[PDB]
Amino acid sequence: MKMRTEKQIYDTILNFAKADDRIRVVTLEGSRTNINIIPDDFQDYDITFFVTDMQSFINSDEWLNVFGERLIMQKPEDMELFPKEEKGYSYLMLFWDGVKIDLTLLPLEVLDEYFTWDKLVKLLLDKDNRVTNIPVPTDEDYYIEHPTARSFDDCCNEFWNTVTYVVKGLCRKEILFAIDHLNNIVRMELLRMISWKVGIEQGYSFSLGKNYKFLERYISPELWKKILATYNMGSYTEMWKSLELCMGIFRMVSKEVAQCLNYLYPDYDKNISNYVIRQKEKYQ
Amino acid sequence: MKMRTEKQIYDTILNFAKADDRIRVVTLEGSRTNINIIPDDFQDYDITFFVTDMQSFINSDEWLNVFGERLIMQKPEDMELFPKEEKGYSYLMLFWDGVKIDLTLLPLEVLDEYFTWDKLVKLLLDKDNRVTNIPVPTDEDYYIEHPTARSFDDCCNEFWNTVTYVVKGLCRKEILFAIDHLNNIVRMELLRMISWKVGIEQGYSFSLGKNYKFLERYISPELWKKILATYNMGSYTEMWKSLELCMGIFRMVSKEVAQCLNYLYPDYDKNISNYVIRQKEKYQ
Secondary structure, three states: OOOOOHHHHHHHHHHHHHHOOOEEEEEEEHHHHOOOOOOOOOOOEEEEEEEOOOHHHHOOOHHHHHHOOEEEEEOHHHOOOOOOOOOOEEEEEEEOOOOEEEEEEEEHHHHHHHOOOOOOEEEEEEOOOOOOOOOOOOOHHHEOOOOOHHHHHHHHHHHHHHHHHHHHHHHOOOHHHHHHHHHHHHHHHHHHHHHHHHHHHHOOOOEOOHHHOOHHHHOOHHHHHHHHHOOEOOOHHHHHHHHHHHHHHHHHHHHHHHHHHOOOOOOHHHHHHHHHHHHHHHHO | OOOOOHHHHHHHHHHHHHHOOOEEEEEEEHHHHOOOOOOOOOOOEEEEEEEOOOHHHHOOOHHHHHHOOEEEEEOHHHOOOOOOOOOOEEEEEEEOOOOEEEEEEEEHHHHHHHOOOOOOEEEEEEOOOOOOOOOOOOOHHHEOOOOOHHHHHHHHHHHHHHHHHHHHHHHOOOHHHHHHHHHHHHHHHHHHHHHHHHHHHHOOOOEOOHHHOOHHHHOOHHHHHHHHHOOEOOOHHHHHHHHHHHHHHHHHHHHHHHHHHOOOOOOHHHHHHHHHHHHHHHHO
């Protein structure tokens, strides 16, 4: 059940922008610019306004009422607990009907370099014709990268080195330390190596999506099940199993990448695998 | 079974530094400077050398052989896959006997501001008496922070807003997106709120450690079990359970913090909890 159509939402946004002297350019960002994303009910409206007077917007929130009644909103460049990590000033809003609008205000001066930030951008309005070469959105910066012999070694090095930090956390009875290093680093390097395997098998012309979220489409159900099994980490016993499964998958996938691209298979696996076994025995 | 004593390791490091004209200051960093850490077999030796000629060290690795035979080493400021994220040039080494040395080379000029970077620092050698006010190591920058009414609201805002991103990932059958947002953000804000609860209950004069790794000492076994149960995430069914458990813990703990510090309890819980229930039903 829709309470508003997509055309009604775009009209609310653009009619507001057209009427306001301060707003000179409007762009669209994110998955709605991406012809390779299947449309669904969760696609945010990522809208950017380029404006002549920033402070006149920040002074009061009343002008936002045109977008509808809100369930929640965040102003991430205006919080105390969190520092600014994007330029400009944004409003992340979830509305009563489940629609989401992430609205960014940027000073007009930033238009000089804005288009270098991301290629998934579509120009919606340009009152003064500032944009002389109009960009065509593309997700090409998100395709799988081909490794080099050096970056392959680097990935193996970071995987196997950080494995030793999971071991330290488990042997010290500091499970949260072990979990964070597995989540933030060890399994991320495993997923990177898997992305290189996908590139070898299927090519370099498509994206696996943010957080590798499209990976399931491009790997065996057998390998997908194992990957998901590594995310059961709520005990020391489960964490040793997850870590050992992660190591087994990494051996199999990095060996395939090395043999397909004619790289040396490094000694990290042999040396750290023995280290893991010895440490586990010492504390068992 | 030790193959080398701590005194032998320190002697290997300092005798090397004393003999070398290029090295003028040596410091120790990390948990070995921290009198509140219980010593164990996994404490790295975090050593920093301040040197007159950086490039003469980087040219060749032979000089590292004095530290022993290595199982693995990383040179993180000299990789292709990973950009530099620390100043200077470091060597992360794990040795044949399980000893770990993380050795950082820094130019002498950086000594002007180095001591502002971290307070868990101990001066080991200063050939020219460059350090006139000698620092005393302390972990005080790692104690629990007292929230303000604004930062309390900010934490609640980020928790409940990001809950909606876990919902989106689960409803889209994009579980890796949902898992990453729960791991990187949702549960981190839960752990932050729990740290504030600990501060109220037990005070502001101690550290919960990196990755909150000492948290188990300061919360009920009952609450610890629930926290660990949230880390079972290897299926859509498990992820809905984890998310709902995370929300329940957050309600209980943020309510206690608000009532103890006389903050307003925000409407995020009510509004987003209903949103979650509706979305789960819509896709079930």
